[PDB]
Amino acid sequence: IQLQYHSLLLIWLLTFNPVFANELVQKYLSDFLDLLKLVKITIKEKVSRLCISIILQCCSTRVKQHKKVIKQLLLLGNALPTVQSLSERKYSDEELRQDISNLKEILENEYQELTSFDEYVAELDSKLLCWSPPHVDNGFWSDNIDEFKKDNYKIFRQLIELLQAKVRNGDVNAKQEKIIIQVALNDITHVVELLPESIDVLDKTGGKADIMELLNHSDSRVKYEALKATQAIIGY
Amino acid sequence: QVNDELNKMQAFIRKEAEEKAKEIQLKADQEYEIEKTNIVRNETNNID
Amino acid sequence: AEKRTLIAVIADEDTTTGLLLAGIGQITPETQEKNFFVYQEGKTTKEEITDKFNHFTEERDDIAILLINQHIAENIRARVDSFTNAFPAILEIPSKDHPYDPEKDSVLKRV
Amino acid sequence: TLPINNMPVPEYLENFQWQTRKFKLDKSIKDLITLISNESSQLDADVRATYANYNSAKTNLAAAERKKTGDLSVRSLHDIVKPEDFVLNSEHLTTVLV
């Protein structure tokens, strides 16, 4: 606990400077997300207050691209729900409460201009998926279907590349890997059933062949997803 | 399980699609003569 | 205008009853008439419907919005088209066993 | 519209990760339950209304088909009543065509 408190104090001191905080945030985005998660994970009031202060310093307007950094954090690291939960939570430090309120306000401001298509794009860029509600609610997959085929079907090409990478990495058959593969297959099936003009693009890129080959996966969910994709291809 | 039935149905659907494609090719072949006549007639008018 | 604060319905019996429950109109103590001029499409007459619509859309009527069911407004479609004045506005409310069709909307036809 | 066979509802069941739209994270449990129930009930009511409107439109189409079928009770009034028997071009005369 003492070591964690000292590390948090050092991080806060380093982030006190705006240039130093801006440099650290870009080079340690994963570390920043881990610290944000640990802020809610940790139960110590002092550690939570230090983590909130460190997050606020990185998100402070004095840092370069402060709005962009805050938006990237709220998108990739799911900072907005964590800040909302922290606001609903209770802390023994008034400074910690004020920092939590400021972080919640910043997250709300960032998410005010956010969109479901933006969340899907961020998830695709992160090359990770866990059956997000945009991939489940038909509203997003219907409104953003036209945008998927934009830029020579750039989104469809990225999804096909992600599916091919998952197929290459599917030999591990990890639970997280299986979930990601299933989510990618569902997204591909949706983007094929809606606006079927991308079927030829997927066939040319080899996505159809990869989907057909994925039917050999031992996972029952993967098998069902492959069967659904095959039915959407030529089946009924 | 039921996956065997789905694979058989999927194979049948793919086989059925081949017959439909052949009909499309047959329909196009018939239209080729009509298109050739129109092209020849248009060229004949220009030549005349 | 200030006197325009009133809503008129000329729809079917069920729609008229529902809107009266909502409380659209009032019975004029002096004129002994109410804005809830309930009139079945099959009952009364086309001439009577046209006369009621003309009275509600003219003669310095206080109705702001004229509510006519699509079924009843279809029979008086000529008068509905003729009513090109900006106010009072007219709407084609759907009726039971008579859904509203975009082709039957006189005002939307101006697009 | 996406086909029902491709609906990811079981895939969502595999995760069940709550979204912000269906319920605010910081909202109260009672408030979140009320909001979700109200939204889902409104969606169900809209679906029921759309189904009723489609049924009414189908009934109207069936009535039109019956009218076009030639049954004189619903067929064109031109063939139902003879032009000679029906009173025409007379201001003091009219036809019944029952």
Short mmCIF file of C-alpha atoms in Angstrom, two decimals:
data_model
loop_
_atom_site.label_atom_id
_atom_site.label_comp_id
_atom_site.label_asym_id
_atom_site.label_seq_id
_atom_site.Cartn_x
_atom_site.Cartn_y
_atom_site.Cartn_z
CA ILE A 1 0.00 0.00 0.00
CA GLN A 2 2.83 2.40 0.84
CA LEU A 3 4.59 1.58 -2.43
CA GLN A 4 1.38 2.18 -4.39
CA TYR A 5 0.82 5.49 -2.61
CA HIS A 6 4.39 6.59 -3.35
CA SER A 7 4.02 5.61 -7.01
CA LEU A 8 0.74 7.54 -7.24
CA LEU A 9 2.35 10.60 -5.64
CA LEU A 10 5.25 10.41 -8.10
CA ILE A 11 2.79 10.10 -11.00
CA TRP A 12 0.85 13.13 -9.76
CA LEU A 13 4.06 15.15 -9.39
CA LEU A 14 5.14 14.18 -12.91
CA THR A 15 1.70 15.06 -14.30
CA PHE A 16 1.73 18.44 -12.53
CA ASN A 17 3.67 19.82 -15.50
CA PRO A 18 1.48 20.03 -18.63
CA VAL A 19 4.11 19.01 -21.19
CA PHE A 20 5.27 16.09 -19.03
CA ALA A 21 1.69 14.91 -18.49
CA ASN A 22 0.91 15.18 -22.21
CA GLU A 23 4.03 13.19 -23.09
CA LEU A 24 3.31 10.52 -20.47
CA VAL A 25 -0.35 10.10 -21.48
CA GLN A 26 0.49 9.34 -25.11
CA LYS A 27 3.32 6.93 -24.23
CA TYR A 28 1.36 5.21 -21.42
CA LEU A 29 -2.25 5.13 -22.61
CA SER A 30 -2.61 1.52 -21.46
CA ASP A 31 -1.05 2.49 -18.12
CA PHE A 32 -3.50 5.39 -17.85
CA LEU A 33 -6.45 3.07 -18.51
CA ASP A 34 -5.12 0.59 -15.94
CA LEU A 35 -4.78 3.38 -13.37
CA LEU A 36 -8.33 4.54 -14.12
CA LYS A 37 -9.62 1.00 -13.58
CA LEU A 38 -7.60 0.59 -10.38
CA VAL A 39 -9.02 3.87 -9.05
CA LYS A 40 -12.41 2.18 -8.78
CA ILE A 41 -10.81 -1.19 -7.97
CA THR A 42 -8.82 0.17 -5.02
CA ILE A 43 -10.63 0.74 -1.72
CA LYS A 44 -8.10 3.08 -0.06
CA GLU A 45 -9.34 6.67 0.07
CA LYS A 46 -5.86 8.17 -0.34
CA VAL A 47 -4.98 5.91 -3.28
CA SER A 48 -8.30 6.64 -4.99
CA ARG A 49 -7.85 10.39 -4.49
CA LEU A 50 -4.31 10.23 -5.88
CA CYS A 51 -5.48 8.25 -8.91
CA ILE A 52 -8.33 10.70 -9.54
CA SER A 53 -5.92 13.63 -9.31
CA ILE A 54 -3.50 11.93 -11.71
CA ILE A 55 -6.32 11.29 -14.18
CA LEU A 56 -7.53 14.89 -13.90
CA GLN A 57 -4.02 16.26 -14.48
CA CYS A 58 -3.75 14.24 -17.69
CA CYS A 59 -7.25 15.40 -18.67
CA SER A 60 -6.54 18.99 -17.60
CA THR A 61 -7.04 21.58 -20.34
CA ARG A 62 -3.45 22.80 -19.87
CA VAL A 63 -2.17 19.62 -21.55
CA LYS A 64 -1.71 19.55 -25.32
CA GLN A 65 -4.67 18.01 -27.17
CA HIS A 66 -6.47 17.79 -23.83
CA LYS A 67 -9.91 17.37 -25.41
CA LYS A 68 -8.59 14.76 -27.85
CA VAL A 69 -6.80 12.85 -25.08
CA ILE A 70 -9.89 12.91 -22.86
CA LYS A 71 -12.09 11.69 -25.72
CA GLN A 72 -9.63 8.91 -26.57
CA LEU A 73 -9.52 7.81 -22.92
CA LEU A 74 -13.31 7.85 -22.57
CA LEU A 75 -13.67 5.86 -25.79
CA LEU A 76 -10.95 3.20 -25.53
CA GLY A 77 -10.82 2.77 -21.76
CA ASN A 78 -14.57 3.11 -21.08
CA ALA A 79 -13.80 5.94 -18.68
CA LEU A 80 -17.32 7.42 -18.71
CA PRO A 81 -19.14 4.48 -17.03
CA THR A 82 -16.33 4.17 -14.48
CA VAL A 83 -16.57 7.88 -13.64
CA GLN A 84 -20.36 7.58 -13.41
CA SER A 85 -20.00 4.66 -10.98
CA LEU A 86 -17.42 6.57 -8.94
CA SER A 87 -19.76 9.57 -8.73
CA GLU A 88 -22.51 7.30 -7.42
CA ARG A 89 -19.95 5.79 -5.03
CA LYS A 90 -18.81 7.41 -1.78
CA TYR A 91 -15.38 8.56 -0.62
CA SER A 92 -13.99 9.82 2.69
CA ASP A 93 -12.03 12.71 1.13
CA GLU A 94 -13.68 15.94 -0.01
CA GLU A 95 -10.85 16.50 -2.49
CA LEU A 96 -11.44 13.01 -3.88
CA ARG A 97 -15.15 13.79 -4.25
CA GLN A 98 -14.38 17.05 -6.07
CA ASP A 99 -11.93 15.27 -8.38
CA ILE A 100 -14.52 12.57 -9.10
CA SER A 101 -17.11 15.25 -9.90
CA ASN A 102 -14.69 17.02 -12.25
CA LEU A 103 -13.81 13.75 -13.99
CA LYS A 104 -17.50 12.90 -14.37
CA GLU A 105 -18.20 16.34 -15.85
CA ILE A 106 -15.31 15.96 -18.30
CA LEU A 107 -16.48 12.48 -19.30
CA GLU A 108 -20.04 13.72 -19.81
CA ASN A 109 -18.78 16.59 -21.97
CA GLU A 110 -16.70 14.16 -24.03
CA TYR A 111 -19.60 11.73 -24.45
CA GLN A 112 -22.01 14.53 -25.38
CA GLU A 113 -20.56 14.56 -28.91
CA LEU A 114 -19.95 10.80 -28.96
CA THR A 115 -21.92 8.46 -31.22
CA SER A 116 -22.55 4.74 -31.60
CA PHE A 117 -20.73 4.77 -34.94
CA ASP A 118 -17.77 6.41 -33.20
CA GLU A 119 -17.80 3.67 -30.56
CA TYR A 120 -17.88 0.97 -33.25
CA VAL A 121 -15.01 2.66 -35.11
CA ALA A 122 -12.97 2.86 -31.90
CA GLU A 123 -13.64 -0.80 -31.14
CA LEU A 124 -12.59 -1.80 -34.66
CA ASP A 125 -9.41 0.28 -34.33
CA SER A 126 -8.66 -1.41 -31.00
CA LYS A 127 -9.01 -4.79 -32.77
CA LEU A 128 -11.11 -6.02 -29.84
CA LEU A 129 -14.78 -6.83 -29.38
CA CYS A 130 -16.90 -8.29 -26.58
CA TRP A 131 -20.39 -8.31 -28.13
CA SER A 132 -20.95 -4.60 -27.60
CA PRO A 133 -24.53 -3.25 -27.67
CA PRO A 134 -23.80 -1.52 -31.01
CA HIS A 135 -23.14 -5.02 -32.35
CA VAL A 136 -26.39 -6.23 -30.74
CA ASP A 137 -28.86 -3.37 -31.23
CA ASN A 138 -30.18 -3.32 -34.79
CA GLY A 139 -30.42 0.48 -34.70
CA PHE A 140 -26.66 1.04 -34.88
CA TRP A 141 -26.12 -1.73 -37.44
CA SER A 142 -28.87 -0.17 -39.57
CA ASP A 143 -27.96 3.52 -39.32
CA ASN A 144 -24.22 2.93 -39.73
CA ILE A 145 -24.60 0.34 -42.51
CA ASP A 146 -24.23 3.02 -45.18
CA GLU A 147 -21.14 4.43 -43.44
CA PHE A 148 -19.59 0.94 -43.36
CA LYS A 149 -19.37 0.86 -47.17
CA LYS A 150 -17.93 4.39 -47.33
CA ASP A 151 -14.33 5.00 -48.41
CA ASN A 152 -14.28 1.95 -50.71
CA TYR A 153 -15.78 -0.09 -47.85
CA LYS A 154 -12.92 0.78 -45.51
CA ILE A 155 -14.84 -0.44 -42.46
CA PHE A 156 -15.70 -3.71 -44.20
CA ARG A 157 -12.06 -4.18 -45.23
CA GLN A 158 -10.90 -3.54 -41.66
CA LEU A 159 -13.44 -6.03 -40.33
CA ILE A 160 -12.32 -8.63 -42.89
CA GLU A 161 -8.69 -8.09 -41.90
CA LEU A 162 -9.60 -8.47 -38.23
CA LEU A 163 -11.49 -11.68 -39.00
CA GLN A 164 -8.50 -13.03 -40.93
CA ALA A 165 -6.17 -12.16 -38.04
CA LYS A 166 -8.52 -13.87 -35.58
CA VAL A 167 -8.62 -16.96 -37.82
CA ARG A 168 -4.82 -16.96 -37.85
CA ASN A 169 -4.84 -16.56 -34.05
CA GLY A 170 -7.85 -18.85 -33.53
CA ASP A 171 -5.69 -21.91 -32.91
CA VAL A 172 -5.42 -20.87 -29.25
CA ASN A 173 -9.24 -21.03 -28.97
CA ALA A 174 -9.13 -18.75 -25.93
CA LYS A 175 -12.41 -17.66 -24.37
CA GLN A 176 -11.66 -14.00 -25.07
CA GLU A 177 -10.40 -14.94 -28.54
CA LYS A 178 -13.54 -17.01 -29.16
CA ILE A 179 -15.76 -14.13 -28.04
CA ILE A 180 -13.89 -11.71 -30.30
CA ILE A 181 -14.19 -14.11 -33.24
CA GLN A 182 -17.92 -14.55 -32.63
CA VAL A 183 -18.45 -10.78 -32.42
CA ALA A 184 -16.48 -10.24 -35.63
CA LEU A 185 -18.47 -12.96 -37.39
CA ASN A 186 -21.76 -11.40 -36.27
CA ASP A 187 -20.61 -7.96 -37.45
CA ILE A 188 -19.53 -9.37 -40.83
CA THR A 189 -22.83 -11.20 -41.23
CA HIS A 190 -24.75 -8.01 -40.43
CA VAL A 191 -22.68 -5.92 -42.85
CA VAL A 192 -23.23 -8.59 -45.52
CA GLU A 193 -26.98 -9.00 -45.03
CA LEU A 194 -27.41 -5.21 -45.02
CA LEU A 195 -26.02 -3.52 -48.14
CA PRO A 196 -25.06 -6.79 -49.90
CA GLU A 197 -22.83 -4.91 -52.36
CA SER A 198 -19.90 -5.73 -50.04
CA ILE A 199 -20.25 -9.49 -50.68
CA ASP A 200 -18.05 -9.21 -53.78
CA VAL A 201 -15.49 -7.14 -51.86
CA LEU A 202 -15.40 -9.72 -49.06
CA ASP A 203 -14.98 -12.55 -51.58
CA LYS A 204 -12.15 -10.70 -53.33
CA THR A 205 -10.42 -9.96 -50.01
CA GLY A 206 -10.73 -13.62 -48.98
CA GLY A 207 -13.10 -12.92 -46.11
CA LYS A 208 -15.64 -15.42 -47.42
CA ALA A 209 -12.97 -18.12 -47.62
CA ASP A 210 -11.82 -17.35 -44.08
CA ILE A 211 -15.41 -17.49 -42.81
CA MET A 212 -15.94 -20.84 -44.54
CA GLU A 213 -12.70 -22.21 -43.09
CA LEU A 214 -13.67 -21.00 -39.60
CA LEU A 215 -16.50 -23.56 -39.58
CA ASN A 216 -13.89 -26.13 -38.51
CA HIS A 217 -13.43 -24.39 -35.15
CA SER A 218 -14.33 -26.62 -32.21
CA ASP A 219 -16.19 -23.86 -30.34
CA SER A 220 -19.96 -24.34 -30.42
CA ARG A 221 -20.58 -20.58 -30.55
CA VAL A 222 -18.01 -20.25 -33.34
CA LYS A 223 -19.70 -23.10 -35.20
CA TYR A 224 -23.10 -21.42 -34.88
CA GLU A 225 -21.66 -18.11 -36.07
CA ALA A 226 -20.07 -19.84 -39.07
CA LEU A 227 -23.36 -21.55 -39.90
CA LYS A 228 -25.17 -18.21 -39.70
CA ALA A 229 -22.57 -16.60 -41.96
CA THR A 230 -22.88 -19.44 -44.48
CA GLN A 231 -26.68 -19.11 -44.43
CA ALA A 232 -26.36 -15.36 -45.00
CA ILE A 233 -23.96 -16.06 -47.88
CA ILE A 234 -26.01 -18.43 -50.06
CA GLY A 235 -28.21 -20.29 -47.59
CA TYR A 236 -31.69 -19.62 -46.29
CA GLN B 1 -26.32 -32.82 -34.05
CA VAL B 2 -28.49 -30.67 -36.32
CA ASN B 3 -25.35 -29.23 -37.94
CA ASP B 4 -25.25 -32.19 -40.34
CA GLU B 5 -28.70 -31.27 -41.67
CA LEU B 6 -27.65 -27.63 -42.05
CA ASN B 7 -24.56 -28.62 -44.05
CA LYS B 8 -26.67 -30.81 -46.34
CA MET B 9 -29.19 -28.00 -46.82
CA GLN B 10 -26.38 -25.51 -47.47
CA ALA B 11 -24.87 -27.83 -50.08
CA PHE B 12 -28.28 -28.24 -51.73
CA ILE B 13 -28.81 -24.46 -51.82
CA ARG B 14 -25.38 -23.95 -53.39
CA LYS B 15 -26.12 -26.68 -55.93
CA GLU B 16 -29.49 -25.09 -56.70
CA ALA B 17 -27.80 -21.71 -57.23
CA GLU B 18 -25.66 -23.30 -59.95
CA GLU B 19 -28.79 -24.20 -61.91
CA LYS B 20 -30.06 -20.63 -61.57
CA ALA B 21 -26.75 -19.27 -62.86
CA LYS B 22 -26.97 -21.59 -65.88
CA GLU B 23 -30.44 -20.23 -66.66
CA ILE B 24 -29.06 -16.69 -66.40
CA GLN B 25 -26.28 -17.61 -68.83
CA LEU B 26 -28.82 -19.25 -71.15
CA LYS B 27 -31.01 -16.13 -71.00
CA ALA B 28 -28.00 -13.93 -71.78
CA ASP B 29 -27.08 -16.12 -74.76
CA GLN B 30 -30.54 -15.62 -76.27
CA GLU B 31 -30.29 -11.86 -75.72
CA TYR B 32 -26.90 -11.83 -77.48
CA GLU B 33 -28.53 -12.49 -80.85
CA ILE B 34 -31.02 -9.68 -80.26
CA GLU B 35 -28.23 -7.31 -79.21
CA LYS B 36 -26.13 -8.32 -82.22
CA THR B 37 -29.04 -7.61 -84.57
CA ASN B 38 -29.54 -4.17 -83.02
CA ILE B 39 -25.81 -3.42 -83.28
CA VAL B 40 -25.74 -4.60 -86.91
CA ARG B 41 -28.85 -2.57 -87.75
CA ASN B 42 -27.39 0.55 -86.13
CA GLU B 43 -24.13 0.06 -88.03
CA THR B 44 -26.05 -0.60 -91.26
CA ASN B 45 -27.93 2.69 -90.91
CA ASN B 46 -24.64 4.53 -90.37
CA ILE B 47 -23.07 2.75 -93.34
CA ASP B 48 -26.09 3.52 -95.53
CA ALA C 1 -55.46 35.34 -33.68
CA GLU C 2 -56.41 35.39 -30.00
CA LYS C 3 -59.88 33.95 -30.68
CA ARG C 4 -58.35 31.01 -32.57
CA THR C 5 -57.78 28.95 -29.39
CA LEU C 6 -60.07 26.04 -30.25
CA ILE C 7 -59.74 22.60 -31.83
CA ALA C 8 -62.38 21.15 -34.16
CA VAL C 9 -62.92 17.46 -34.95
CA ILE C 10 -65.15 16.10 -37.72
CA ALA C 11 -63.92 12.51 -37.47
CA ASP C 12 -65.83 9.27 -36.90
CA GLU C 13 -67.82 8.48 -33.76
CA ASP C 14 -65.01 6.63 -31.97
CA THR C 15 -62.40 9.26 -32.83
CA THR C 16 -64.79 12.06 -31.89
CA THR C 17 -65.48 10.38 -28.55
CA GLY C 18 -61.77 9.93 -27.86
CA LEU C 19 -60.90 13.52 -28.69
CA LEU C 20 -63.87 14.77 -26.65
CA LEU C 21 -62.52 12.75 -23.71
CA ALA C 22 -59.21 14.49 -24.36
CA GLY C 23 -61.18 17.74 -24.15
CA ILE C 24 -60.55 19.45 -27.48
CA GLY C 25 -63.59 21.70 -27.80
CA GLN C 26 -66.39 23.45 -25.96
CA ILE C 27 -70.09 24.06 -26.60
CA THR C 28 -70.77 27.70 -27.42
CA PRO C 29 -73.43 29.06 -25.03
CA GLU C 30 -74.59 31.67 -27.54
CA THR C 31 -74.35 29.62 -30.75
CA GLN C 32 -75.62 26.42 -29.04
CA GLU C 33 -72.96 24.52 -30.99
CA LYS C 34 -69.83 22.57 -30.09
CA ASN C 35 -66.56 21.95 -31.90
CA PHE C 36 -67.05 18.18 -31.45
CA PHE C 37 -69.29 17.89 -34.51
CA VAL C 38 -69.44 14.11 -34.47
CA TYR C 39 -70.60 12.75 -37.83
CA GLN C 40 -70.28 9.18 -39.06
CA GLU C 41 -68.92 8.67 -42.57
CA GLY C 42 -71.75 6.28 -43.43
CA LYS C 43 -74.45 8.37 -41.76
CA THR C 44 -75.51 11.96 -42.57
CA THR C 45 -74.61 13.09 -46.09
CA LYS C 46 -71.66 14.26 -48.15
CA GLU C 47 -73.34 17.66 -48.55
CA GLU C 48 -73.80 17.87 -44.78
CA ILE C 49 -70.14 16.99 -44.22
CA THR C 50 -69.07 19.63 -46.74
CA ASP C 51 -71.29 22.24 -45.09
CA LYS C 52 -69.89 21.42 -41.64
CA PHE C 53 -66.32 21.60 -42.96
CA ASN C 54 -67.02 24.94 -44.64
CA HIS C 55 -68.54 26.30 -41.43
CA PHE C 56 -65.54 25.12 -39.41
CA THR C 57 -62.94 26.42 -41.89
CA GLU C 58 -64.71 29.72 -42.63
CA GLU C 59 -67.40 32.05 -41.23
CA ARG C 60 -64.88 33.48 -38.74
CA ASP C 61 -64.69 30.16 -36.91
CA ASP C 62 -62.55 29.96 -33.78
CA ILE C 63 -61.03 26.56 -34.64
CA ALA C 64 -57.24 26.56 -34.81
CA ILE C 65 -56.78 22.99 -36.09
CA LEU C 66 -59.47 21.15 -38.02
CA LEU C 67 -59.38 17.41 -37.34
CA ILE C 68 -60.94 15.30 -40.11
CA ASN C 69 -60.63 11.53 -40.28
CA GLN C 70 -59.05 10.27 -43.48
CA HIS C 71 -62.19 8.28 -44.31
CA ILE C 72 -64.54 11.25 -43.90
CA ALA C 73 -62.10 13.70 -45.50
CA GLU C 74 -61.83 11.45 -48.57
CA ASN C 75 -65.49 12.08 -49.41
CA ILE C 76 -64.91 15.84 -49.09
CA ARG C 77 -61.48 15.69 -50.72
CA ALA C 78 -62.50 18.42 -53.17
CA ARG C 79 -63.28 20.83 -50.33
CA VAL C 80 -60.11 19.77 -48.50
CA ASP C 81 -58.02 20.60 -51.58
CA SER C 82 -59.92 23.87 -52.02
CA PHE C 83 -59.07 24.84 -48.42
CA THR C 84 -55.67 26.23 -49.39
CA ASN C 85 -55.65 28.81 -46.59
CA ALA C 86 -52.70 28.62 -44.20
CA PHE C 87 -54.99 28.54 -41.16
CA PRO C 88 -56.86 26.68 -39.82
CA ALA C 89 -54.67 23.65 -40.47
CA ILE C 90 -56.23 20.31 -41.41
CA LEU C 91 -55.06 16.83 -40.44
CA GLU C 92 -56.04 13.38 -41.75
CA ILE C 93 -56.41 11.36 -38.55
CA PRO C 94 -56.48 7.57 -39.04
CA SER C 95 -59.79 5.86 -38.31
CA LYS C 96 -60.63 2.38 -37.09
CA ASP C 97 -60.43 0.01 -40.07
CA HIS C 98 -59.22 3.04 -42.06
CA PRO C 99 -55.49 3.80 -41.77
CA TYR C 100 -54.11 7.13 -42.90
CA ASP C 101 -52.55 7.05 -46.36
CA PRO C 102 -49.93 9.59 -47.50
CA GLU C 103 -51.61 9.85 -50.91
CA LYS C 104 -54.84 11.01 -49.24
CA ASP C 105 -53.10 13.87 -47.38
CA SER C 106 -54.25 17.05 -49.10
CA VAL C 107 -51.71 19.32 -47.41
CA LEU C 108 -48.80 16.92 -47.91
CA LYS C 109 -49.73 16.74 -51.61
CA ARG C 110 -48.38 20.28 -52.07
CA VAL C 111 -44.84 18.86 -51.86
CA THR D 1 -33.69 -5.25 -42.40
CA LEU D 2 -31.34 -7.78 -40.85
CA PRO D 3 -32.73 -11.34 -40.99
CA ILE D 4 -33.98 -12.94 -37.78
CA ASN D 5 -31.55 -15.85 -38.20
CA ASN D 6 -28.70 -13.31 -38.03
CA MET D 7 -30.10 -11.58 -34.93
CA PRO D 8 -27.31 -11.54 -32.32
CA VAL D 9 -29.69 -11.90 -29.35
CA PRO D 10 -27.99 -15.11 -28.09
CA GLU D 11 -24.60 -13.48 -28.72
CA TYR D 12 -25.69 -10.59 -26.51
CA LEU D 13 -26.96 -13.11 -23.95
CA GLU D 14 -23.42 -14.51 -23.91
CA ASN D 15 -22.21 -11.14 -22.54
CA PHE D 16 -25.24 -9.16 -21.27
CA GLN D 17 -23.08 -6.05 -20.86
CA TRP D 18 -25.43 -3.24 -19.87
CA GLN D 19 -25.35 -0.14 -22.07
CA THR D 20 -25.73 3.52 -21.17
CA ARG D 21 -28.74 4.09 -23.44
CA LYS D 22 -30.98 1.47 -21.83
CA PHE D 23 -30.19 2.81 -18.35
CA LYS D 24 -27.93 5.49 -16.92
CA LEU D 25 -25.09 4.06 -14.86
CA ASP D 26 -25.36 6.77 -12.19
CA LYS D 27 -29.17 6.60 -12.05
CA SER D 28 -30.95 5.07 -9.08
CA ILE D 29 -32.04 1.43 -9.20
CA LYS D 30 -35.72 2.37 -8.94
CA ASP D 31 -35.25 5.19 -11.45
CA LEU D 32 -33.36 2.93 -13.87
CA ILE D 33 -36.04 0.25 -13.58
CA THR D 34 -38.77 2.82 -14.23
CA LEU D 35 -36.96 4.25 -17.26
CA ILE D 36 -36.22 0.85 -18.80
CA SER D 37 -39.77 -0.39 -18.20
CA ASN D 38 -41.26 2.77 -19.70
CA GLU D 39 -39.04 2.62 -22.79
CA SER D 40 -39.69 -1.07 -23.41
CA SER D 41 -43.44 -0.63 -22.87
CA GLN D 42 -43.46 2.26 -25.35
CA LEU D 43 -41.61 0.09 -27.87
CA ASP D 44 -44.12 -2.73 -27.37
CA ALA D 45 -47.03 -0.32 -27.80
CA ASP D 46 -45.49 1.03 -31.01
CA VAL D 47 -45.03 -2.51 -32.33
CA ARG D 48 -48.65 -3.36 -31.49
CA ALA D 49 -49.88 -0.18 -33.19
CA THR D 50 -47.83 -0.96 -36.30
CA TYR D 51 -49.26 -4.49 -36.38
CA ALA D 52 -52.79 -3.11 -36.04
CA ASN D 53 -52.19 -0.62 -38.86
CA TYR D 54 -50.81 -3.39 -41.08
CA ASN D 55 -53.87 -5.52 -40.29
CA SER D 56 -56.17 -2.62 -41.19
CA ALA D 57 -54.30 -2.07 -44.46
CA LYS D 58 -54.56 -5.78 -45.26
CA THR D 59 -58.30 -5.64 -44.55
CA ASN D 60 -58.63 -2.66 -46.90
CA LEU D 61 -56.68 -4.52 -49.59
CA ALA D 62 -58.92 -7.56 -49.15
CA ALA D 63 -62.00 -5.34 -49.48
CA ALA D 64 -60.57 -3.84 -52.67
CA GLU D 65 -59.86 -7.33 -54.03
CA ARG D 66 -63.42 -8.41 -53.21
CA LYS D 67 -64.75 -5.31 -54.97
CA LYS D 68 -62.62 -6.10 -58.03
CA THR D 69 -63.73 -9.76 -57.93
CA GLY D 70 -66.93 -8.81 -59.77
CA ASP D 71 -69.50 -9.50 -57.05
CA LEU D 72 -72.22 -6.97 -57.84
CA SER D 73 -72.64 -6.15 -54.15
CA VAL D 74 -69.09 -4.73 -54.27
CA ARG D 75 -68.42 -4.61 -58.01
CA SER D 76 -68.44 -1.50 -60.19
CA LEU D 77 -71.73 0.39 -60.06
CA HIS D 78 -71.65 0.85 -63.85
CA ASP D 79 -72.56 -2.79 -64.52
CA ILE D 80 -74.74 -3.08 -61.40
CA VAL D 81 -77.43 -0.69 -62.70
CA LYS D 82 -78.39 -0.39 -66.35
CA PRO D 83 -77.93 3.16 -67.71
CA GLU D 84 -81.40 3.09 -69.30
CA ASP D 85 -83.13 1.88 -66.13
CA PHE D 86 -81.21 4.34 -63.97
CA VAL D 87 -82.53 7.90 -64.10
CA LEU D 88 -80.03 10.26 -65.71
CA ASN D 89 -79.97 13.79 -67.17
CA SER D 90 -83.14 14.59 -65.19
CA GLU D 91 -83.25 17.10 -62.33
CA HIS D 92 -86.48 15.68 -60.85
CA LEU D 93 -85.50 12.00 -61.23
CA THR D 94 -82.91 9.75 -59.61
CA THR D 95 -81.87 6.11 -59.43
CA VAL D 96 -81.63 3.64 -56.55
CA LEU D 97 -79.20 0.98 -57.84
CA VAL D 98 -79.77 -1.28 -54.83
#
